[PDB]
Ligand binder design. Structure first.
Ligand SMILES: OC[C@H]1O[C@@H](O[C@H]2[C@H](O)[C@@H](O)[C@H](O[C@H]3[C@H](O)[C@@H](O)[C@H](O)O[C@@H]3CO)O[C@@H]2CO)[C@H](O)[C@@H](O)[C@@H]1O
Ligand SMILES: OC[C@H]1O[C@@H](O[C@H]2[C@H](O)[C@@H](O)[C@H](O)O[C@@H]2CO)[C@H](O)[C@@H](O)[C@@H]1O
Ligand SMILES: OC[C@H]1O[C@@H](O)[C@H](O)[C@@H](O)[C@@H]1O
Length: 362
């Protein structure tokens, strides 16, 4: 049964061992001792643990086992931050993140199995709180990319999958935030009403459980939480940062029968005004680590600022011959050469460190 208030309150955030290991190896390739020590400070900043392949599901057990042992040893209640990201025909409007599951080859049933495997590890460790981000990009694409044939063909499956994950996770007391795009995707005034409709319907079909806490925004993106000085890339959009986006979405969601809360990714938001076009998302050059994870937010509607996308892990390959090459990853404002999405992109990480705002102290 669900407790009241902000679900992050009074919990220590478990630090990702996978990202810690990656940063450690990134730091070991950096010779400048002031940059090296700065790099190593990042494994101390909480990020979300992505389960983008079904071969990782058992690692959740290992993380929950580890977090439970920390809790027993310290007496400090722990919270593990995870991302559910493996819908069949994933990333239907792009090719950079492409997914192991196909709708043509038993995809929906395989996704159900993937969710059950996550659920079966979570059952093993009930004494630790979990916060989960559900399927980045999926529903966002249903609002704005129904024109794309692959997204149309995936719609039923996306909705069924997200609803299945929500009901299974909410049964086990996991706090969920469904991915809801960003200010430059759904904050456009035409997409605000249909977004509110869709997320409210998902909430309804998943059973209106209080463990379905709200939405996540700006995942794998670079938008400001709050900008005084406008970004000219946002020309035509009147909600040009994440707070305006949330302040315009929340009342509509309420009206559609869901008092949603929010969390906001700020992991690569340190530097604004680094894109020529607002739809440019792939390995954007010159980005920096942004506002640190905090429960001191500018709104009652926002539970937490977080780092969902772990900076340094690539968004997509720039190798034009690769099967998963997306032309957005070869843009002029993209850091090239880039390795496959998910894999370590060292020079990108280094710039994220160098461009950190607030700066990383050694
Ligand atoms: O945020 C990371 C994900 O983004 C993806 O692309 C989306 C862009 O991020 C988003 O800015 C853009 O928004 C469009 C909108 O669809 C349209 O209604 C409006 O008029 O113009 C905007 C242009 O700024 O949409 C795209 C998706 O089509 C990637 O697909 C995804 O892989 C990535 O994780
Ligand atoms: O399996 C490789 C790698 O995936 C990482 O998740 C990626 C995902 O693969 C990518 O498509 C998406 O755009 O970004 C996320 C986060 O970088 C995951 O974090 C790694 O642990 C994993 O090894
Ligand atoms: O600003 C555009 C930048 O794109 C990147 O891919 C390159 O590494 C930079 O040298 C270049 O200037």
């Amino acid at each position: 049964v669900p407790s009241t208030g902000n679900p992050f309150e009074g919990y220590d955030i478990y630090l990702s061992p996978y990202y810690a290991e990656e940063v450690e190896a990134a730091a070991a390739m950096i010779d400048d001792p002031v940059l090296k020590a700065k790099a190593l400070k990042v494994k101390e900043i909480p990020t979300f643990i992505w389960f983008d392949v079904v071969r990782k599901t058992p690692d959740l057990g290992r993380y929950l086992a580890d977090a439970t042992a920390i809790q027993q040893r310290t007496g400090r209640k722990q919270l593990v931050q995870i991302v559910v990201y493996d819908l069949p025909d994933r990333d239907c409007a792009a090719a950079a993140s492409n997914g192991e599951f196909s709708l043509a080859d038993g995809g929906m049933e395989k996704y159900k199995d993937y969710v059950d495997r996550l659920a079966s590890e979570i059952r093993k460790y009930p004494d630790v709180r979990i916060v989960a981000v559900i399927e980045p990009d999926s529903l966002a694409n249903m609002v704005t990319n129904m024109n794309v044939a692959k997204c149309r063909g995936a719609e039923a499956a996306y909705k069924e999958g997200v609803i299945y994950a929500l009901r299974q996770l909410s049964a086990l007391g996991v706090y969920s935030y469904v991915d809801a795009g960003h200010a430059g995707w759904l904050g456009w005034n035409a997409n605000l009403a249909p977004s509110a409709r869709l997320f409210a319907q998902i909430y309804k079909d998943a059973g209106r459980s209080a463990f379905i806490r709200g939405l996540a925004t700006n995942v794998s993106n670079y938008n400001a939480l709050s900008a005084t000085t406008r970004d000219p890339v946002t020309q035509g959009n009147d909600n040009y940062d994440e707070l305006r986006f949330i302040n315009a979405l929340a009342p509509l969601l309420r009206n559609e029968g869901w008092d949603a809360k929010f969390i906001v990714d700020q992991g690569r938001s340190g530097v604004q005004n680094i894109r020529q076009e607002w739809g440019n998302w792939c390995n954007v050059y010159g980005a920096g680590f942004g506002m640190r994870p905090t429960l001191n937010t500018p709104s009652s509607a926002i539970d937490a600022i977080v780092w969902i996308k772990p900076g340094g892990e690539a968004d997509g390959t720039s190798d034009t011959s690769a099967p998963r090459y997306d032309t957005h990853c070869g843009k002029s404002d993209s850091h090239k050469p880039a390795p496959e999405a998910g894999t370590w992109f060292q020079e990108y990480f280094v710039n994220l460190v160098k461009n950190a705002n607030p700066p990383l102290a050694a």
